[PDB]
Symmetry: D2
Subunit: 106 residues, 4 copies
Amino acid sequence: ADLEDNMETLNDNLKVIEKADNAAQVKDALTKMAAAAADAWSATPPKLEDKSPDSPEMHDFRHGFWILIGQIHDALHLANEGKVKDAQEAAEILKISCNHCHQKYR
Amino acid sequence: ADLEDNMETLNDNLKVIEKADNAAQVKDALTKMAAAAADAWSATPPKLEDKSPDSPEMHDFRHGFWILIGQIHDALHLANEGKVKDAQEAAEILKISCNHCHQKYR
Amino acid sequence: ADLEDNMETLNDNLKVIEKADNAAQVKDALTKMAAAAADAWSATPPKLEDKSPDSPEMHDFRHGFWILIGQIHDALHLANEGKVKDAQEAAEILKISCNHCHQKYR
Amino acid sequence: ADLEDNMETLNDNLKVIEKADNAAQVKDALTKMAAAAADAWSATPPKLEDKSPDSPEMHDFRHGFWILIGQIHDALHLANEGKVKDAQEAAEILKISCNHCHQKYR
Ligand code: HEC
Ligand code: HEC
Ligand code: HEC
Ligand code: HEC
Ligand SMILES: [Zn+2]
Ligand SMILES: [Zn+2]
Ligand SMILES: [Zn+2]
Ligand SMILES: [Zn+2]
């Protein structure tokens, strides 16, 4: 997918997590978010179109996806263990990761 | 890229790190490895073609890529900081992650 | 130090980071926070005195320190790469970890 | 506990994980290891006795404990999920972390 459609997938499943009823719903939403972030890994965002893929700025951009995926990784372990509510609370932390990359690069 | 091509990229660049003599070369190889792993994230390997994408096996498959990318992540900070020899030694750990996934799913 | 002492050290240095210039003020605050969190690792907080250190609740308690230390860990790499602004911005996510533990166990 | 006691705790419990036939012994051993590593956090090893707790060598020393605790963190999630064989294969990776610190600072 392109960067914009992966972002739609991130947003849709972030919402699913916040309103989920059970561990299966949380795990499915987290898995979909991680695959969307991994697929967006090599995207160049519009405001960085002039930057080398080997530059400090593009490493910072990808670093934002590493943070997001790492956060999803931990939440998914929690949901695998049945700590659904703790997994759901990880959405508050994820949201900041969204905001931070958006405020620098969107 | 397909799974086999991402693996060639992982293989080529792990050997680069093992033979490298400067920080820029290690950083460049680490970034290529991470992009290949992120691109391989949603691949289904031949031995899991019968498995549901939500199966435990496919989560465990993707989990091996998270481990690898996480190791690359820390090594890339060490390389960014000048600790070239430490970043280079992280290839010994990287290799164990290669072996573990291969033993299970290759 | 006891838990209350380490919490003050976290609180003071969390404020130092938000109100800092230069990698030095930030690095030094992060280093002290990591040492305080590590020293707190095995503390039994009042609301869990009836739980054994093998209980699920005590694992969930320590797990909140792992999240905190992992965030400090990444912030310190950023500060050591000269990314003082990005390091200072970790303070927002750190505070969320403070609050998530407090809401359950303080 | 002093550094020698925390190292004995790590050595004993790494062997427990290797020999283990059940999840409970793995989880218990990993918990003991994490506590030992957290307690060793602010130790000064003999070869750095003359240096500052703030020295770059001492940051680099502590960094080895973060690597170890992060690896224990993931293996404990796997043990908690009943993936006992996968948690035990994490011991191979832990050992390299033991060796990497010993080669530099023991
Ligand atoms: C960088 C590392 C990012 C992270 C992490 C997240 N997003 Fe993002 N997103 C990013 C950019 C550069 C853009 C701009 C796209 C463009 O073509 O200019 C976006 C865009 C979105 C959108 C589109 C909405 C709009 O502004 O019209 C959405 C809905 C969105 N992003 C959601 C989202 C969520 C929920 C995230 C975290 C879970 C998230 N994004 C992370 C870069 C990055
Ligand atoms: C799972 C999570 C894996 C990780 C981590 C790594 N590899 Fe891998 N590799 C994996 C599979 C399932 C396969 C088989 C793919 C197929 O279609 O048969 C492979 C294969 C390879 C190969 C051979 C590629 C080919 O042309 O057939 C190589 C050279 C290879 N892998 C290298 C490699 C390295 C160096 C890794 C770590 C840095 C690594 N792989 C990780 C699954 C997984
Ligand atoms: C659990 C994993 C915690 C994390 C992470 C943080 N804190 Fe905490 N804090 C915790 C407990 C159980 C308590 C109660 C201690 C008691 O004996 O009652 C506290 C308390 C505090 C306090 C008040 C200390 C006092 O004098 O009573 C402060 C100022 C405080 N905590 C700050 C703080 C900050 C800034 C944190 C993040 C950087 C943080 N705590 C994390 C448990 C946990
Ligand atoms: C640095 C960050 C280290 C990590 C990670 C591990 N160890 Fe270690 N170890 C370290 C030092 C500096 C020393 C010497 C301490 C001294 O005062 O001599 C050690 C020593 C040991 C020992 C011998 C203890 C003794 O009484 O002589 C053992 C058995 C040992 N270490 C085991 C061990 C294991 C199994 C580790 C990984 C799980 C490990 N150590 C990590 C520094 C560091
Ligand atoms: Zn966790
Ligand atoms: Zn690190
Ligand atoms: Zn980082
Ligand atoms: Zn994991």
